[PDB]
Amino acid sequence: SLNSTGLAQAAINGLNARFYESSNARWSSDEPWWISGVALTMVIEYMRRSGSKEYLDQVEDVIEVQRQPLSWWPSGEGEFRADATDDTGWWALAMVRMYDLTGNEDYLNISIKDEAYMRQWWTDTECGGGLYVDIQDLTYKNAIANELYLKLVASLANRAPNATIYLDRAQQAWTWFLGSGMINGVNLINDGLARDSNTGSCYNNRLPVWTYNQGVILGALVELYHATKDESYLLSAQAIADAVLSPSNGLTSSSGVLTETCEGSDSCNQDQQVFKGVFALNLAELGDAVAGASSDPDAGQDYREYLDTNMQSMYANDRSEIVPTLFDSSTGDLYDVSWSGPFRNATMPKQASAIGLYVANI
Numbered sequence: 001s002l003n004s005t006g007l008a009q010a011a012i013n014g015l016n017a018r019f020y021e022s023s024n025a026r027w028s029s030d031e032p033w034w035i036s037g038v039a040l041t042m043v044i045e046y047m048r049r050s051g052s053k054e055y056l057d058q059v060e061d062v063i064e065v066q067r068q069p070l071s072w073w074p075s076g077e078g079e080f081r082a083d084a085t086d087d088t089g090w091w092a093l094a095m096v097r098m099y100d101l102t103g104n105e106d107y108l109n110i111s112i113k114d115e116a117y118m119r120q121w122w123t124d125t126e127c128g129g130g131l132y133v134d135i136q137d138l139t140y141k142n143a144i145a146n147e148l149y150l151k152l153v154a155s156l157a158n159r160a161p162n163a164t165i166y167l168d169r170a171q172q173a174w175t176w177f178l179g180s181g182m183i184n185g186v187n188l189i190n191d192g193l194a195r196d197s198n199t200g201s202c203y204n205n206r207l208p209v210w211t212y213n214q215g216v217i218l219g220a221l222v223e224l225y226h227a228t229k230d231e232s233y234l235l236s237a238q239a240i241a242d243a244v245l246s247p248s249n250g251l252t253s254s255s256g257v258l259t260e261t262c263e264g265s266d267s268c269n270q271d272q273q274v275f276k277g278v279f280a281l282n283l284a285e286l287g288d289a290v291a292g293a294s295s296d297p298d299a300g301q302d303y304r305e306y307l308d309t310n311m312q313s314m315y316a317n318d319r320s321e322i323v324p325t326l327f328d329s330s331t332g333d334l335y336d337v338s339w340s341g342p343f344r345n346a347t348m349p350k351q352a353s354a355i356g357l358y359v360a361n362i
C-alpha cells in the first residue's frame with residue numbers, strides 16, 4: 001500500500017526545504033558539487049517516471065547556473081567540464097536524463113561536450129586503456145570515472161547524431177573495463193587500478209566494493225543492450241546485480257537491506273552517503289530492461305522485489321518528517337544513511353540517496 005511516487009515527492013520536498021539554496025541554484029554548497037549533480041538526476045528521474053513537471057523550473061535554474069565556468073576550474077569553460085572526469089560525468093549523465101525528459105537538444109549537446117572533454121584523459125599507454133579521474137595529476141584510473149564514461153558513450157550511441165563513433169567507443173570501453181581486472185572473482189567491482197612499480201602493468205587495487213560502482217555499470221550495460229540488442233550485455237549486468245543481492249557478499253544484510261560497507265563503523269563520509277541510491281536507480285533501469293527483453297512475467301522480479309524490500313525498510317526505519325511551523329508550511333521527509341539503522345540526522349547526500357530509492361520504485 002506504499003506510494004513510491006508520493007514518497008519520492010515528499011523526499012524531494014524535504015531535500016528542497018533543508019538543502020536547496022535559491023541564491024546559488026544548487027543544493028548545499030557545503031557538500032560536494034558532484035552530489036548536486038546526483039540530486040538533479042534524482043529529481044529529473046522522478047519527473048520522467050512519474051510524468052510530473054513540478055520541479056522543471058527549479059531544475060532549469062540549477063542547470064543554467066551550474067553550467068557556467070566553474071570558479072575552481074575555469075579552464076574547463078563550464079558546461080560542467082570540471083577538474084575531475086567523474087565530477088563531469090555525473091552532470092553529463094544528468095543532462096542525458098534531461099534530454100530524455102524534455103527532448104531539448106540543448107541538454108544532449110552538453111552531454112556531447114562532456115564526452116569529448118572526458119575522453120581527453122583516456123590513454124592506451126597505461127593499463128591498456130581507460131581514463132584518469134584526477135585531471136591535474138593523472139595517477140588514478142578508478143572504477144567510477146570509467147563507469148560514468150562508459151554509460152555516457154553508451155547513452156550517446158542511442159541518442160546522438162554520430163551514433164556510430166559513440167557505439168564503437170562504448171564497445172571498446174566495455175572491453176577494456178572487463179579486461180581490466182576491476183571486476184573481481186565474485187563479479188563485484190573494486191575501487192580502481194594500481195600500477196606495478198617495475199613493470200607498468202595494472203591490477204585490481206582491492207580497495208572497497210562501493211555500491212555505486214556496482215550500479216553505474218548496470219546502466220551502461222543496459223544502454224549497450226539498447227544500442228546493439230545483444231542480450232550478452234544484460235547477462236553481464238545481471239551477474240553484477242545478482243552478486244550485490246547475495247548476502248554472502250555482504251552488500252545485502254540478512255534482512256535483505258542494501259548496506260554500505262562503511263555503515264557498520266558509522267564512518268560513511270559525504271561521498272559514500274549518496275552511493276546506495278545511485279545503485280538503486282541503476283538497478284531499476286536493469287530490471288526494466290530485463291523485463292522488457294523477455295515474455296516471462298517473472299522477468300526482473302528479484303530486482304523489483306529487492307527495491308521494494310529496501311523501500312519498505314527505509315520508509316519504516318530511516319525516515320523523519322520535517323516539523324511544520326506557523327510560518328514555514330514546508331512539508332516532506334528526511335532520511336539518514338542506513339536504510340535499516342535508525343534515523344539520527346539528514347544530510348543532502350543521504351537525502352539524495354533516499355530519493356533515488358523511491359524513484360527506483362516508481
Ligand SMILES: OC[C@H]1O[C@@H](OC[C@H]2O[C@@H](O)[C@H](O)[C@@H](O)[C@@H]2O)[C@H](O)[C@@H](O)[C@@H]1O
Pocket residue numbers: 034084086087088090133142143144191192210271272
Ligand atoms: O568514497 C570512495 C570513493 O572516493 C572517490 O572520491 C570520491 C568522490 O569524488 C567525486 O569527486 C566523484 O565525482 C565521486 O564519484 C567520488 O565518489 C575515489 O576517487 C573513488 O574511486 C571512490 O569510490
Ligand SMILES: OC[C@H]1O[C@@H](O)[C@H](O)[C@@H](O)[C@@H]1O
Pocket residue numbers: 029031032033034072083
Ligand atoms: O575540487 C572539488 C570541488 O568540489 C566542489 O564541491 C566545491 O564546490 C569546490 O570548491 C571544489 O574545488
